[PDB]
Amino acid sequence: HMSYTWTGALITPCAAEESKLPINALSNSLLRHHNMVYATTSRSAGLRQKKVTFDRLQVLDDHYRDVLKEMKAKASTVKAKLLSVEEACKLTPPHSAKSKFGYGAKDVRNLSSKAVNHIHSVWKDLLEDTVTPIDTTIMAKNEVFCVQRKPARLIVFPDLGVRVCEKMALYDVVSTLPQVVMGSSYGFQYSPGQRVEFLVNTWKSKKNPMGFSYDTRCFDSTVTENDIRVEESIYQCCDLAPEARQAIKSLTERLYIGGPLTNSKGQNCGYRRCRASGVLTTSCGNTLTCYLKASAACRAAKLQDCTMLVNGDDLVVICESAGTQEDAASLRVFTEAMTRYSAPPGDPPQPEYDLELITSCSSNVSVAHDASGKRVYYLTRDPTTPLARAAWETARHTPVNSWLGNIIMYAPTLWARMILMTHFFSILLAQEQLEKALDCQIYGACYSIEPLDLPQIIERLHGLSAFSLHSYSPGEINRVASCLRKLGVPPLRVWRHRARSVRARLLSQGGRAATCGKYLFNWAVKTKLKLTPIPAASRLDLSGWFVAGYSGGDIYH
Numbered sequence: 001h002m003s004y005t006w007t008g009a010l011i012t013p014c015a016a017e018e019s020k021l022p023i024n025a026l027s028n029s030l031l032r033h034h035n036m037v038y039a040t041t042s043r044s045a046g047l048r049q050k051k052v053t054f055d056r057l058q059v060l061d062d063h064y065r066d067v068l069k070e071m072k073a074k075a076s077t078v079k080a081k082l083l084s085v086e087e088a089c090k091l092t093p094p095h096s097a098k099s100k101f102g103y104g105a106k107d108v109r110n111l112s113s114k115a116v117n118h119i120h121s122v123w124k125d126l127l128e129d130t131v132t133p134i135d136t137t138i139m140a141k142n143e144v145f146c147v148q149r150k151p152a153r154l155i156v157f158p159d160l161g162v163r164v165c166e167k168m169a170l171y172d173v174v175s176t177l178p179q180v181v182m183g184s185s186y187g188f189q190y191s192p193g194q195r196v197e198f199l200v201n202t203w204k205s206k207k208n209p210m211g212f213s214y215d216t217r218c219f220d221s222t223v224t225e226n227d228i229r230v231e232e233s234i235y236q237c238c239d240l241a242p243e244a245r246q247a248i249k250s251l252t253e254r255l256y257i258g259g260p261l262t263n264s265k266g267q268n269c270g271y272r273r274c275r276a277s278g279v280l281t282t283s284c285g286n287t288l289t290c291y292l293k294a295s296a297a298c299r300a301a302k303l304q305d306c307t308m309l310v311n312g313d314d315l316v317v318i319c320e321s322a323g324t325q326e327d328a329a330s331l332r333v334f335t336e337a338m339t340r341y342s343a344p345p346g347d348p349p350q351p352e353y354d355l356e357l358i359t360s361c362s363s364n365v366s367v368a369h370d371a372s373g374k375r376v377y378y379l380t381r382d383p384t385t386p387l388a389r390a391a392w393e394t395a396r397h398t399p400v401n402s403w404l405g406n407i408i409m410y411a412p413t414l415w416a417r418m419i420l421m422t423h424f425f426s427i428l429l430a431q432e433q434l435e436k437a438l439d440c441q442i443y444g445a446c447y448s449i450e451p452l453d454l455p456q457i458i459e460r461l462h463g464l465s466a467f468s469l470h471s472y473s474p475g476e477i478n479r480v481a482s483c484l485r486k487l488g489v490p491p492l493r494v495w496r497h498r499a500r501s502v503r504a505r506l507l508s509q510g511g512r513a514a515t516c517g518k519y520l521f522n523w524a525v526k527t528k529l530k531l532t533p534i535p536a537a538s539r540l541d542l543s544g545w546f547v548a549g550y551s552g553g554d555i556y557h
């Protein structure tokens with residue numbers, strides 16, 4: 001029961017990889033300490049392999065089977081359809097890794113018959129054969145961080161023809177089943193506004209609130225063949241076409257349970273018997289499996305009135321406190337149960353009696369005040385990683401714009417409004433690229449977004465209070481400040497000053513550009529405008545957003 005076995009062949013890059021922050025004319029206006037920012041490369045893949053390779057033991061008790069029976073009972077109420085070749089093709093990102101069989105993501109989106117002819121044959125092969133392990137490519141992720149140095153994460157994904165077949169069999173299931181099985185506990189149904197509402201409401205619905213986040217060590221690595229067969233048995237409870245049942249059975253045996261790892265050069269690196277990071281079912285399976293283990297571990301622990309919020313491997317529990325030592329006892333039991341279930345912790349959990357101190361989906365609840373003085377709650381984070389990545393994206397064009405995703409999801413935050421919006425609107429102005437659509441990743445799915453729709457997207461995700469927030473908390477204001485001192489970012493009076501400029505230049509241009517200046521930078525002037533609902537905002541089609549997670553699922557909406 002080893003997560004992985006290795007041949008000794010190295011995980012190879014396909015293009016050269018920069019580990020050091022690229023510098024341009026713009027870099028120093030955002031960040032001075034360039035030595036603090038790095039990107040992970042293949043060079044560290046060996047250390048990741050070490051970290052993720054271990055023996056899993058799993059001990060499964062009545063709590064585990066009682067929760068699973070309940071989950072399957074809900075799964076039975078789900079009906080899911082097959083997607084046609086065309087539908088699945090249209091879900092393929094333009095930028096998506098090309099097929100080994102001589103065709104690419106754009107050929108797939110075009111419905112070019114060489115692509116579609118292959119896909120039909122991969123599909124046919126899935127129905128006929130249910131035993132033959134499907135090839136995966138193993139690559140090192142290039143992601144940017146601040147030093148404190150992390151090894152590259154491993155992405156494992158099958159060929160583009162298989163990925164389109166996964167969509168035909170399972171897109172509708174992984175879109176619809178998780179909300180039916182987990183109800184309000186399924187995190188990816190929530191906009192950031194909806195998520196802060198659920199957390200705060202959940203917290204207040206307790207007499208004596210206690211909550212903790214649960215950090216599983218390398219959760220993909222802790223997922224067993226058992227866990228992956230249990231997931232397929234949940235999928236199989238749905239009312240499915242028999243062609244769909246056959247495909248899900250085949251993809252489970254041949255791809256999801258495990259299979260061989262090939263590097264960029266086409267050499268054999270070893271064998272996987274855990275979760276693939278890069279398949280359609282990674283989000284949904286992690287979320288189901290985390291919810292099953294954690295739900296059963298709650299019952300073991302005798303946590304009273306448990307509310308859970310689960311996003312893939314990211315887990316928050318809020319429950320009734322039974323005093324501090326009782327709570328501390330509960331959490332150790334909780335941890336023993338998760339360990340037996342093969343989800344041992346990274347940091348051991350800590351009970352918390354202040355909601356603002358709980359981190360879940362890399363975010364904490366904080367509080368500011370809107371126009372009318374009224375307290376509004378919002379999600380924020382330490383902005384160290386988002387700014388490190390903004391620095392890197394200032395000097396290199398990346399196909400996913402972390403800064404755009406971070407503006408959309410953290411729009412109400414001091415740091416997103418003062419730094420990210422100021423910095424990136426100045427760049428789009430100087431290049432006159434306000435009207436040029438950018439790809440960004442929300443809950444793993446890729447979206448093409450026009451920056452000039454940002455005010456409308458922000459009203460819909462967060463409400464109009466996102467444009468009027470002030471009197472951020474002492475503790476939020478400190479963490480922003482300490483991060484700027486760390487990264488050598490200019491102070492927030494410099495950003496206010498810059499934003500007055502950007503605001504002025506955006507109003508200059510009228511149309512949506514003016515709206516952007518009105519709404520995004522109202523905070524920068526003291527003689528404030530009165531901000532009121534945007535007309536084009538309820539025209540925006542935000543169905544597809546906050547339905548489901550698709551991390552590593554190759555999904556474009």
Ligand SMILES: CC(C)(C)[C@H]1C(O)=C(C2=NS(=O)(=O)c3ccccc32)C(=O)N1Cc1ccc(F)c(C#N)c1
Pocket residue numbers: 191192193195283311312313314361362363378379380405406409410441442443444445549550551
């Ligand atoms: C755009 C980014 C900033 C990356 C966003 C996101 O898409 C994921 C996420 N994407 S994922 O599908 O890869 C995944 C898996 C597990 C946990 C989170 C995520 C994430 O954690 N994010 C930070 C986040 C999440 C929920 C929130 F309400 C708020 C706020 N306010 C902020």
